[PDB]
Amino acid sequence: VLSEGEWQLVLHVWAKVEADVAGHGQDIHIRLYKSHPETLEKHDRFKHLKTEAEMKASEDLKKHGVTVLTALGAILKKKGHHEAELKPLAQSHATKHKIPIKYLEFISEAIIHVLHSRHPGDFGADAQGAMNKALELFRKDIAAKYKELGYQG
Ligand code: HEM
């Protein structure tokens, strides 16, 4: 559970993310793929992408990152009351894409890194702590939904 103050900090930085969902998404994916090269293997149309510039140039990847962060943003806005938003996402990621919780930590780390890089003055210790607790909550609940669907990774 987050405090109301923690949610605010979460949603305050999120509003900043929303000034350029596309760019944030690209940075988060590029960081994810470079930090944890095994994650790229989940994406068939993203393996032809060999350099940081090809990634940035890929309209497919850019669109996808907007889809990711839109879905995560909508989750965050519910301040924990996110079962309806989280279920379809558990569903595809558990039974179709097969994304281990470990990979959700990796992208969570990339999110934190990109957030700090782009918004250091709106992402100090408290705001980092809060986004961290939010992503941890997202991860705990999605893991519980993975298990409900029969998926252990
Ligand atoms: C913040 C965490 C994440 C959010 C909110 C998220 C959200 C989404 C959404 C909304 C879609 C499109 C609909 C769907 O299939 O669910 C999607 C597709 C997908 N996601 Fe995730 N995702 C997240 C993490 C990941 C990670 C870490 C991987 C791989 C390491 C991944 C792999 C995929 C793949 C392979 C697809 C289908 C893309 C396609 O082939 O068209 N996702 N993601």
Side-chain angles (χ1 to χ4, degrees), residues 27 31 108-118 123 128:
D27 292 344
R31 174 58 173 194
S108 292
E109 294 160 19
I111 295 161
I112 299 308
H113 171 91
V114 168
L115 282 189
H116 180 77
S117 307
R118 303 205 175 201
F123 208 53
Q128 211 173 149

Side-chain angles (χ1 to χ4, degrees), residues 2-111:
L2 277 76
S3 62
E4 174 51 26
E6 275 167 347
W7 287 121
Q8 289 183 193
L9 287 170
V10 162
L11 299 182
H12 176 79
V13 62
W14 209 257
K16 290 262 140 54
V17 177
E18 290 186 342
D20 175 21
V21 177
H24 280 80
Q26 292 175 129
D27 292 344
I28 291 160
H29 290 100
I30 290 153
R31 174 58 173 194
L32 180 53
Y33 301 147
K34 186 255 195 169
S35 282
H36 300 281
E38 75 263 47
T39 67
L40 189 44
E41 288 165 53
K42 293 295 185 180
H43 299 268
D44 281 13
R45 286 157 316 138
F46 310 154
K47 298 233 69 207
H48 67 99
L49 271 23
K50 310 269 204 70
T51 51
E52 197 240 319
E54 283 188 330
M55 292 197 171
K56 247 145 188 218
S58 168
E59 212 206 343
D60 232 40
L61 177 62
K62 184 177 54 158
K63 283 178 299 202
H64 183 62
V66 171
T67 292
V68 171
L69 291 178
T70 292
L72 172 67
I75 285 162
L76 291 174
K77 288 160 174 189
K78 302 313 167 276
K79 291 187 297 182
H81 295 269
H82 54 216
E83 177 195 306
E85 292 76 15
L86 198 62
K87 214 141 78 158
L89 197 81
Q91 189 77 240
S92 54
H93 286 66
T95 72
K96 199 231 253 225
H97 317 308
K98 297 295 210 132
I99 311 302
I101 303 296
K102 222 202 314 64
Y103 285 17
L104 272 17
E105 310 172 307
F106 297 166
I107 191 166
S108 292
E109 294 160 19
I111 295 161

